[PDB]
Symmetry: D2
């Protein structure tokens, strides 16, 4: 496979896109270090939470590919827990080639109506939590000496801010900037850093209830959420997003660092 | 008198660019609500801090333009302080036409070498603090019913992330997103929201030794910091930045909302 | 006035936006060199053409501002005619401070359905014609030695390409590039170069029959043409576009070169 | 292989990037239609031209992959030649799945110093010739009814214009626009359209002598041409660009349409 004998570290791997990346990267030959908070993060995040069962199942799916999975329940806002998982992973697998910084949360409210808890939770998990993930993994990837590839999961909202979630758009634009700063800073080490910007991926993060409420109260907001030109009905799958991550993780994308890749089937073109 | 009889609320107004905006908007006719921490923000911010004398100085300069100045020492991370200043300001002036969210801080370190204090300070002042400023002022502007103009001070690093300051670049990209989400959400209220992206402005924030050290350690980082094509030697002034803020604040820029204006004499073109 | 004693050269000045710039820059104190083809460009351009009477009217409006107008019927694709008008303008006024490259045409068709005529006309007037305008005017501005400001009229379709007019979108993206290349090349001469990107300006170019037909045949294209957030009904006026041009033309925008200014009341945010 | 039983049409296939794409897509299992002017395009293009022999070598390299090659000497500016090659191609192969519009030329000069020959050659080949290529191929792809993937070769200068070649930067920005217009127009047909933006690729197009002449006269222009952060010395190869084209051509990129992919090893981040 394109990743035979390599090792990837993936956050938010309990379900959804994170699980898809873990399984796909395993299918490509990588052993997997995977973590997820496996719990509701906040009263302000109103869709269904991931469970520890979900993470165990990612691990079974990785093992089904003939690979090894080290999994752990942790919060990416918990620096000590991240350091320890990285250390345990390096002891078990001995190298670190791919990082997928994927854990995130979403909530909704107009900028001046957002609460402290809404703000702090989204900025804290999405932006600070990603930074902590990067700070914990980068030294191990440098020390391993094999170069590497880091994929930061931003959002289409990380390139074009959307109404009703300025805190989420801010967190995700912040991720675009981290990706690009880190691409410059890690160039000399042979480590590439790129970001993906998905749209309309069918996971529990998309709460149809929340969207209907937003468009009910502010009908003009619909103009920020158009159909996808090459798939004008319904949603893309988490596995489809994993096609992009697999390619970025491997040598086929050796010419890309600092790129913002929209995974949106054309929606950002409208 | 492009702003005759109007009221502007400005953060970080003790000195530097914030001072220049206060005095200019005053000379255009606006009375001024202005605030600043007037103290060191963090050991991690190594250049000289502003003083309470600086903010009194801004107040006197505004008064010399024939206008009123309400000033206060507060931290933009202190929500109650912000709310109280907005309330006292509305009591005194009865309207709010312009917000210039200008308070900010800078420090330097590669992404994986940043400390919790460096990160938390930059994200908390620049991103969260700006959000708190917007949340505290937007409802007064809506209630006044005269529409208005909000200027968010981002940076050239909020459009093109730079090496050695990923936290700062993230904070300022986050501000780009806040500007654009807010522009959409406030359009129906007749309030325009735009961001400026300065480069090389002569204020204490760019005392040169930090940058000298960064380049000495990481020589390749110089490529991210080119000359300004229309001023290839030296620095732009804080009063030059206030020309742009003055035009965005007033009606001459009525066709602009959601725009990112580089104030860089062309440096972003390189 | 902000442009007192200065001289501006404006193309497509017979009506619409170009007329509004001519009259506005005259009100600011500038003398005006104004030109327009005053004729239908092509059978492929289906809205009403400008007439010589239109250009004489622009001249009368300039003269009512107390300023002088040199006007000339010419085609921006005609190099000799451009060179001759620049020369006559320098003989009359002895200087050249502002250039507004505004002449433009529009037609509609899907990429693979466009005719040679449709393509050649739009590329030829918009992209090549603007280039000829800059080549003919830039040497005179340099020679005069007072620095200057050049405004290139692109479109929102010069930043975000639209369906049904790939030729026009390509021409206007070409103008964004020309603006930026020229800004770098002219920096050393003290000449600023910026582009404006309007949307939904009420001129004959936007007679609604063509757009109505495009939408009826290709209904999904409607997603590319959202409302303006701060003006969700109707169109902006040519005089409103002239507010931005006037500011760019003068010293208040001395910190801007190489900037792309959307004049769209927020529409590109959606 | 990923493109087994499919057909790809490639322009500029005599050598350099175009040859790399033809041989790679053949290795993935596609039969090839390939064409090239195999002659000097213009006195204004000063580096060595491709030869008919170059194109025959490409054909052999395709046949070595065990695939069929239909090749033809033609100018992409020549519409009848394109239609006839497309027609012969469909008769021979029966379908058309991938188009790589790669033919291009480069020359150098400041905007107001460019000759008519310089301008007309670069716009005619790069912008108009690419348009003609798309207009000739898109109908055949639609009629075949299998969807498809179209790759437009722009340049880093199609994202960030460069000094000394405003005409080339304009032509390549125009290609960005064509890509995105076409992505919206072709979505309903299951045809994806994406653009690549390479930098520093080792082909005859990079003439060390012309660069040295440019920097000799205008030293400040060097700031637009930085090193590649993940390959700070030397050039990337044509085969490395072909990794990106092979991925875009195939189903692994099914989530991408309207994307601008920089192929620059990070250079655009500086
Ligand atoms: N669903 C979409 O349409 C969409 C679009 C663009 C971007 N995104 C982003 O994609 C990424 C994956 O989201 P998803 O769609 O699979 O949704 P999801 O909610 O199903 O998956 C996110 C996972 O992250 C975990 N997580 C949340 N906070 C965490 C924390 N503090 N520490 C550790 N783990 C945490 C969750 O438990 C969950 O398992 C997220 O970053 C999200 O913002 C989603
Ligand atoms: N100087 C530059 O080159 C440059 C370039 C681009 C952007 N910026 C941005 O411009 C803005 C103004 O900075 P400047 O150049 O005038 O530097 P400065 O340090 O001279 O001024 C910033 C002011 O903000 C105040 N401030 C900092 N943290 C605060 C807090 N928590 N609460 C209240 N006040 C606080 C400071 O006391 C100071 O008076 C900042 O947002 C900065 O990030 C500066
Ligand atoms: N109307 C809009 O909504 C809109 C939006 C974005 C950009 N634009 C651009 O604004 C600019 C001004 O257009 P407008 O809206 O005022 O439309 P308009 O057609 O009323 O004005 C354009 C003027 O350019 C002149 N012209 C056309 N081809 C010429 C040529 N070859 N040589 C000399 N003159 C020529 C015309 O005769 C006409 O007077 C154009 O470049 C157009 O592409 C318009
Ligand atoms: N080399 C670089 O660094 C670089 C960087 C960015 C983009 N590009 C672009 O990549 C593409 C490939 O260029 P390359 O680097 O392989 O250079 P190249 O000159 O080796 O290849 C270009 C090929 O296109 C052919 N061609 C030129 N004009 C033609 C016409 N009118 N009709 C048919 N064929 C024609 C040439 O004969 C040549 O074989 C071009 O579009 C170029 O602009 C190159």
């Amino acid at each position: 496979g394109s990743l035979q004998g390599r090792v990837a570290f993936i956050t938010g791997a309990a379900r959804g896109q994170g699980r898809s990346h873990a399984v796909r990267l395993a299918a490509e030959g990588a052993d997997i270090i995977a973590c997820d908070i496996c719990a509701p993060v906040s009263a302000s995040v109103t869709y269904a939470p991931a469970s520890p069962e979900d993470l165990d199942e990612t691990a079974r799916l990785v093992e089904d590919q003939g690979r090894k999975a080290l999994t752990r329940v942790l919060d990416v806002r918990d620096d000590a827990a991240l350091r320890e998982l990285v250390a345990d992973g390096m002891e078990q697998f001995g190298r670190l080639d791919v990082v997928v910084a994927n854990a995130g949360v979403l909530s909704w409210g107009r900028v001046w109506e957002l609460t402290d808890e809404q703000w702090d939770t989204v900025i804290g998990v999405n932006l600070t939590g990603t930074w902590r993930t990067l700070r914990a993994t980068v030294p191990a990837m440098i020390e391993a000496g094999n170069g590497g590839s880091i994929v930061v999961v931003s959002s289409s909202a990380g390139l074009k801010a959307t109404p009703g979630n300025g805190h989420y758009s801010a967190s995700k634009h912040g991720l675009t900037a981290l990706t690009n700063t880190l691409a410059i800073e890690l160039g000399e080490y042979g480590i590439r850093v790129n970001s993906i910007h998905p749209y309309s991926v069918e996971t529990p993060m998309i709460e149809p209830e929340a969207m209907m409420e937003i468009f009910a109260r502010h009908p003009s907001f619909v103009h920020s959420f158009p159909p996808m030109p090459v798939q004008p009905n319904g949603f893309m799958t988490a596995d489809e997003v994993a096609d992009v991550v697999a390619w970025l993780a491997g040598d086929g994308s050796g010419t890309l660092t600092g790129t913002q890749i929209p995974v949106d089937k054309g929606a950002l073109k409208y």
